Assembly symmetry: C4
């Protein structure tokens, strides 16, 4: 059958910026999206360690090394700058792939690296 | 594998009407549904810029040019008229299509166009 | 590609009962599940017109004509008896089926019929 | 078509621990994950009987018999220790499999067994 499963996760990134107007959901440092294998435009979940918020949105490729981690519009509420959040990207898969699979997990720097 | 990805998005539309009774989730201007490629009856996500609300519902085809963007029943709370919201529609796809894909993005007029 | 779409929907049913303890998500009048084409055990979304709540749970076949529409455990909060809610069931499909498809929509009686 | 359906459910487990910092979503007793057929890394839903909370996250394999059921980071708000919650894992399936299918349901001990 088809089970949905943890394909990638950026562990403990700090929320760089945040802007209520103009949208782009979550714009992530290019290096992080490749490291965590994420495609510009991909359902991403966000969990805020500082205030337990939870969102589901697409991800936007930000500049490299900039350690960018921005929440654009709407999610600008709930999640804020200086907030340690977690990014999660699942993926439905055949019960087969489901069994054996190494999720692209990215631990990160206090500066996001 | 199958990743879920941003297929379409109506950026910054203004909420035309809103009615708690009688349902139709979100009724969108015909032109917008075609422009953003959305089928009457298709999971659509709404994010309210003015108040950070977040819903998941189907979409209903409204009249053309009427710049209609209505929220019928239930979602009538959370999301309101005069609110700048964002409509998003993802779509699970083969990791292949995933890579190369142009999401139908629709920027819009203060009158929805 | 595979898009997720409105497969079925029970429009404006009134919440018969509700019990916090012992689980069964939403137990629906048999006739309703067949009418709206729903299988015992199937992700169903609920939207409460009286108070805009929103849940995602499986469905449970209830007795016929009893016009039963119960919310078992957890969802017992959020959604209550005497509440006009809406049940929705999507379904991922090949972009082909997506195009031409008649969603099994069920308008209902003040007594659920 | 493809319908999403209740594949597995751990009924009435008691929340063992909970830690806001360091992440791992929900860590479940190995035995439970096999019993309920869940793979380390798989979207799981939680519903808190004591406080009607509702989360969506992945599952992490905890130690056996420890009757472990921990909520790591973010979800640490909403859901708490001593809370009777319910774990649910759906799965999209071909309309065929959908019909005939025995969901792996696990009733549990006040000590989680």
């Amino acid at each position: 059958m088809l089970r949905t499963m943890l394909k990638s996760k950026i562990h403990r990134a700090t929320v760089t910026c945040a802007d209520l107007h103009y949208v782009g959901s979550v714009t992530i440092d290019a290096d992080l999206m490749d490291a965590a294998d994420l495609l510009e435009g991909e359902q991403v979940t966000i969990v805020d360690i500082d205030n337990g918020a939870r969102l589901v949105t697409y991800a936007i490729t930000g500049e490299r090394g900039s350690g960018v981690i921005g929440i654009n519009g709407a999610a600008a509420h709930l999640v804020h700058p200086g907030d340690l959040v977690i990014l999660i990207a699942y993926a439905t898969m055949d019960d087969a792939r489901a069994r054996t699979y190494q999720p692209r997990i990215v631990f990160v720097d206090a500066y996001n690296k």
